[PDB]
Amino acid sequence: IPMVAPLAREFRGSHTHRATIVTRVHTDAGIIGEAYTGDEHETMFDIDRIIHEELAPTLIGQDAMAIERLWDSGYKVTFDILRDRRLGLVALAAVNTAIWDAVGKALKMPLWKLWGGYRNELPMIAIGGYYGEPLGSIADEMHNYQELGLAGVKFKVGGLSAAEDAARITAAREAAGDDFIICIDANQGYKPAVAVDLSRRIADLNIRWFEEPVEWHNDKRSMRDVRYQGSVPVCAGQTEFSASGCRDLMETGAIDVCNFDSSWSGGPTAWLRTAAIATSYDVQMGHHEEPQVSTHLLASQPHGTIAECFHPDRDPFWWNMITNRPKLNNGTLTLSDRPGLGWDLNWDYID
Amino acid sequence: IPMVAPLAREFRGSHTHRATIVTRVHTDAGIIGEAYTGDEHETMFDIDRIIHEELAPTLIGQDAMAIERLWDSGYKVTFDILRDRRLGLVALAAVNTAIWDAVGKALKMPLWKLWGGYRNELPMIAIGGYYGEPLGSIADEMHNYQELGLAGVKFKVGGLSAAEDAARITAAREAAGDDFIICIDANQGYKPAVAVDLSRRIADLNIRWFEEPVEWHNDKRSMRDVRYQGSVPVCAGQTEFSASGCRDLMETGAIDVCNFDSSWSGGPTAWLRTAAIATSYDVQMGHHEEPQVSTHLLASQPHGTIAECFHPDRDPFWWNMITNRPKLNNGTLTLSDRPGLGWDLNWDYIDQYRV
Amino acid sequence: IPMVAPLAREFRGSHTHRATIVTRVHTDAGIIGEAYTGDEHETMFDIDRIIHEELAPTLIGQDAMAIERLWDSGYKVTFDILRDRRLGLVALAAVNTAIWDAVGKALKMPLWKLWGGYRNELPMIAIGGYYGEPLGSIADEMHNYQELGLAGVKFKVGGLSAAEDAARITAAREAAGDDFIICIDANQGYKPAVAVDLSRRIADLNIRWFEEPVEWHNDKRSMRDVRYQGSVPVCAGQTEFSASGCRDLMETGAIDVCNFDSSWSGGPTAWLRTAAIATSYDVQMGHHEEPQVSTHLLASQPHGTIAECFHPDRDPFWWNMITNRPKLNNGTLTLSDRPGLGWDLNWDYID
Amino acid sequence: IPMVAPLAREFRGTHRATIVTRVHTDAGIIGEAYTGDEHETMFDIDRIIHEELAPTLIGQDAMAIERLWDSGYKVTFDILRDRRLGLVALAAVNTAIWDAVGKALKMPLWKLWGGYRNELPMIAIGGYYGEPLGSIADEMHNYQELGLAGVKFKVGGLSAAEDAARITAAREAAGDDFIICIDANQGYKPAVAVDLSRRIADLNIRWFEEPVEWHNDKRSMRDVRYQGSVPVCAGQTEFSASGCRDLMETGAIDVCNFDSSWSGGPTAWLRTAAIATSYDVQMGHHEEPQVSTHLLASQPHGTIAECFHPDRDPFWWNMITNRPKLNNGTLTLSDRPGLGWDLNWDYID
Amino acid sequence: IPMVAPLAREFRGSHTHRATIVTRVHTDAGIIGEAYTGDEHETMFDIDRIIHEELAPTLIGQDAMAIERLWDSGYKVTFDILRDRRLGLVALAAVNTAIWDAVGKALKMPLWKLWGGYRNELPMIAIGGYYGEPLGSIADEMHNYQELGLAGVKFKVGGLSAAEDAARITAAREAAGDDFIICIDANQGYKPAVAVDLSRRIADLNIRWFEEPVEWHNDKRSMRDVRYQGSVPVCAGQTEFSASGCRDLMETGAIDVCNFDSSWSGGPTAWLRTAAIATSYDVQMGHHEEPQVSTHLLASQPHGTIAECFHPDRDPFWWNMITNRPKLNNGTLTLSDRPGLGWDLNWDYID
């Protein structure tokens, strides 16, 4: 199926702001592959430019079925020495996502199955527990996510001290009950000793995992210590650039869960390689937000964990962009059989 | 001490069965080295062929005293790339053990001493806790073991959820009291996360060690993690083919104790290499089953731990094969000064099950 | 700022004994660099011989300002194949510390500031808890240290069973109360299993760190395990000959704190290098004894920890050698703004 | 010396862009320096310098380097932007502070940072594809004229065969006594890089900089190091001392060219240097000669300073009016305090 | 067989000098285990002292047949944290070797065979090529070693540039011809770059191995590099304190041959463990000098290489202390069936 044209529409919404780039790739057949990815702002147009003048050229007229070849060719945009490597990886991820959506449709295959079809449903939690209580107190916020029918939450920490953040984590546990998944994300905020201290303080609250517990410079070796001296499993990966970066994390013994973001690292083709390596290390797979694509990627794997999304006011793109978004049935989301990503977009909202 | 002949006597005995080969190395002096090794059944005869057709040629007429020269030549049988590598290892181990017995007798030295002589006594446990209670309830099984003089038990697990298995281990601990050693064996049965769950659940039960907790493909690194995220020491090495494999285990930080099985990996010569490696990594040595050889090996090393055997039902050989077997006295077994393995084989028994 | 002469003044003092070599480096200016370092009794004269016959010829006439150059040529004394490598390392440190004291003075800069200037105040613990109770019972001793203004103690262990030594530590904790710092020092006396056992027992006594828990031959890896299987952080680095040796310790994941001794392996120049290597591994810096120098080294670093000393009956030097010794204030110490090491040696004592 | 103010003067000469950072003190001392070559993000890094860094410095003791550097380090914690922005803003401030404390102490940085030596060879970065500076032979001779010690020849863009030919040419034109480092800019496939390395084993190449693709450089360039014939150099792409420790721990490099203006300033660069000594790796430095000359000179394992042709980099040549004269490709630093450079305010405006 | 008395006889012979300790372990049987170990001169009486006051107490009345037990008990002497660890290792080694000779005699087994019996025949080379040419010119020296029947020489280097040393090595190869083994030893004298350069320079002279090429501090990694960037095998280990240290050199991929010295690190019991570690690493075994002991250690091992001795003028102890050295034939030495080390010491030379 030759490709005829890749177009891209730019978004922006407030709540400070949410942006994304809808990418579509029309083919010589009647199929149009589409997916929106990346929530990037200040660099949204340098990325859109990379897609039209750098990636577009090596795609137009190519067989959309030979993904390895196309991906191999577009992977050169990550070689530019003068710009932030992410601009090339996010652009590449955008085209790789839209293409994959096209191939699935052309094979009449939902992406969760084309990628392995381990299962068509998984739990989904919400990223909350933001400092400042912009969503109310931990009690109200936690109960709101339950009413929404979510499986659990990715509670934010890393801003206060072990003791203080330990209270907040405890408040959540008590408000939601034991029948709620609770993960904690530090965003690389703690120094190794603080994170260990915290890890031990909540050893009894049943925390799913401690996401990016320590500072950035030596996170591999440091979260490894937090992992072996702490009481809760460690998760990371979103900050890596490629599969090689997630492998190094795994080799260092720093993680239990890898949350490599495909929208940030070159698309599903890159994420599926990380996925395969995770099996050889017995490491579970996760995915930093991006529900529109994580659900399929995760579900498709025997080691996939949970899917993540934000509160409707934190992220409008997932609650409005999709009109056929499955109903949360007791925390778990079941993917349909609709080929590709199988999503129905909302063009009135798009504009 | 020239090599005149190798006699092989394999035999099966049902309890579903117990098999082994008895190897005998005759010498031009009066001496006759012998020992029974391994528990191969379906491949037993392939191993027999490797022994007489591949190993005997390099032994007959050679100086049994130059064990390294002999081991070096025979090691090549493990090079065949079209067969299971274990066949060559079990063959090499069988003959190697026999020779050591011969040299022990020629030197009028009991192996536990000729190999080191750290001590001549050590505790022994029984491998039990089988699912299905084939030996009675957990309680009855431990009591039977204590009354038999055993030091403790290597309890089976790896077949249920962390909750279930933890409950089963409690019973065992609860039924035997504190003066009893308790190790657990999952046989590579759990997924890392589950192994860790269990490990922490039995943290206050004084569990000697968690043997082979995780699945086979990534066992080294995964059990490494069960070792640092869990609460109990970890043991492995039995599934390794050689000393190198064990070294990787120790270099990975996977084990606290290595249970390299000599009968399965080239005999005492290779085991002692592994045990030497173990000392540089401060890893304690253990040995999976084979009490007729492990007692000497483990007793000779400064870092040796405990020997293992089964219930007479599970394994009839240890109890019926040896005649001058020492009486278990309150968990420990002390070796005599009898040269070599110093064992007295019961040929009425052997003759009864020869094949 | 050239060299005019190196003066050495050896002396012993009995309580087995306390020995040390005072070194003075004279400049063409009116400045004299001086410092006492070590505690090498029997090999004392051997060291002074190295200082005079091997190092002096590479310093006289040279510029003291070029620390890196003088160091690089002096390090040759560590190459001798026929003697303990410590001999050459101690001699190089003896002159290296004095030289630093000289440029410190010639720059009107107190060493803690010249070497980084992170802070100018830090806690100090006493190294006691000796088997045989040479300073009374554990209760009397901890109190004796509290009355002196010390922040805590580094308790000696490594000689008895985990249970016994665990009771000993509980005694010190129970006597001092919670507002006291407690570290334990095994001096490479335990087997890993015993160390991990002990570590779990004292888990509720809030131990700052477990210094050199295991036997020497496989210490790196063995203590890494006591770190991941145990409950308290591990410290080591004094037994190491160089920055590289401390790096291995760090690369193995063996330590939480590196206590590399400036005086035992080259001097401040080597110590500072190890400190930089530690920042890269999120490892904190400590320093085995040598308060007359450790205070300046540790105070300058952002990851610096605690300074250490001995009871006056154990080490008369730190307590009698310095006439302007800083005052302990509820466990803390503060350095003046005086150039170099800023110390006033009591010559009424050096005799 | 307390901070009284930090002034930022950025300018532009396909382009050259830098920020001249100046740190005013309570005394009459002003720590100044220009650092890095950011053009697109220039104004964002300038903003980080005044809105995020300035507050942590005004009224502080410039002497306590560790303390100041330690609080300004958080500019690198922002998860929503290139990490390089804070890193660059931090280097700018840290570099200007060093010159200040250097001037306050009457010490030239090359000596204050160690003072191993005051002289070192300097090579130029050239041999650009397209021959913008003329044929290889003429560009080599041109650098010979200028008295440079050698060149850092660009490669990584053609076949092992072609680049080897280009590199040979250079050897042919320059002679034997001329340093020749090659630079791929992470452009080769491991296999191709070994091929090139082997082919040039007799041209006496000083080192091979960033030979293989970025994604797995550590392990990959390490293989080039062991399967090839010439020493490998990398580090400029690392964000920190830790990244550099990794290249070293992996056995990837022979020389580390960590870039000071790019990763936090001299305070960070000197940490990577301490580390390197423990691995016996030599220290190099990606361009920025106005700062690298002192850093490298001060270390016992220092190697070479780098600069560009007057056509490619006007700043070094036009801004500092008292650049040392080259002698057989070697450069001697003066005893002037701090960095000792005298900017050209005419050119600045 | 019980031990009744450990007798030591200090040895001092001028050439600077050769010193050694002749240790004799007496038993209630006829047997007397005897041997002379290492070369310590000034620390000599310290070592001798450690033997009588620290080790003899743990041997008298004991069973010499229980080596592991005895060795494990003697090891504690290497625990003294206040003195060069070598003193205890050398004392431990003296006692251990003497005991092995006793058990070999009690078992009527020659050690080479009791330790393995791989072979009773191995080649021997001489340590030579000393700077200053005190043993004549290179050619003269090579021809000397050949007329003596030696199989080769261990040529000294590490003092000059790669070029000049490459020529010294060239002179030797050219004076000895190809029928000669040529190993080189830098005694940790070069910098990595210079050693690689020298290694690449001599790639055609057929050099058996490059011994301790680089400086001490980071020798493990730095020699791995010499090994992979150079052209000749690398040998080291004699500078290591234990088998763990040799295990580290192996895990780092630094050597091809391990020349761990028994008389310097705890004796045969220790060296045999290192030998076993070495087979799991496909690394060959060597032995820094001590031919009176190494001949048996190396021959017993299937991966043993070459025994080393000195020129009669560099060391008279191997040529005069052993009244019954087998004669060199075609550069190889052949061991007899005499129990233990099977040597007849020259008591004339001893008194």
Computed CA radius of gyration of chain A, to the nearest angstrom: 20 Å
Structure annotation, total helices of chain A: 13
Major beta-sheet overview of chain A:
9 strands, mixed
* SSE order of chain A, one letter for each helix or strand: EEEEEHHHHEHEHEHEHEHEHEHEHEH
Span between termini of chain A? 30 Å
Strand content of chain A: 15-25%
- The CATH homologous superfamily of the largest domain in chain A is termed Enolase-like C-terminal domain
- Structural class based on helices, strands and sheet pairing of chain A: alpha/beta
Can you tell me the overall shape of chain A? globular
Into which percent range does the helicity of residues of chain A fall?
25-40%
Overall tally of structural domains of chain A: 2
Largest interchain contact: B-E, 32 and 32 residues
Keywords (chain B): Metal-binding
Binding site for Mg(2+) (chain B): 185, 211
Protein name (chain B): Mandelate racemase/muconate lactonizing enzyme
Organism (chain B): marine actinobacterium PHSC20C1
Q: Can you offer a commentary on this structure?
A:
The PDB classes it as isomerase. The entry lists the keywords Enolase, Metal-binding, PSI-II, nysgxrc., Structural Genomics, Protein Structure Initiative, New York SGX Research Center for Structural Genomics, isomerase. The entry is titled "Crystal Structure of Mandelate racemase/muconate lactonizing enzyme from a Marine actinobacterium". This is part of a larger assembly, with five copies of chain A. Chain A has 351 residues and is of the alpha/beta class. Chain A folds into two domains: 1-108 and 347-351, Enolase-like, N-terminal domain (Enolase-like, domain 1); 110-346, Alpha-Beta Barrel (TIM Barrel), CATH 3.20.20. In chain A, 38% of the residues lie in helices and 17% in strands. The first copy, chain A, contains 13 helices and 14 strands. Chain A has helices at residues 44-55, 67-74, 85-107, 111-114, 138-147, 162-176, 192-201, 219-229, 243-252, 268-281, 291-299, 316-320, 347-350, and strands at 3-10, 13-14, 17-18, 21-27, 32-37, 121-128, 152-156, 181-185, 210-211, 234-236, 257-258, 284-285, 307-310, 332-334. In chain A, the strands form three sheets. In chain A, strands 6, 7, 8, 9, 10, 11, 12, 13 and 14 form a nine-stranded mixed β-sheet that branches. A three-stranded antiparallel β-sheet of chain A has the order 1-4-5. Chain A has a two-stranded antiparallel sheet with strand order 2-3. In chain A, helix 5 (138-147) packs parallel to helix 6 (162-176). The longest helix of chain A is centred in the first third of the chain and has 23 residues, at 85-107. The first copy, chain A, is globular and about 60 Å long. The B-E interface holds B 63, 65-69, 71-72, 107, 109, 113, 116-119, 242-244, 246-247, 251, 272-274, 276-277, 279-281, 300-302 and E 63, 65-69, 71-72, 107, 109, 113, 116-119, 242-244, 246-247, 251, 272-273, 275-277, 279-281, 300-302.
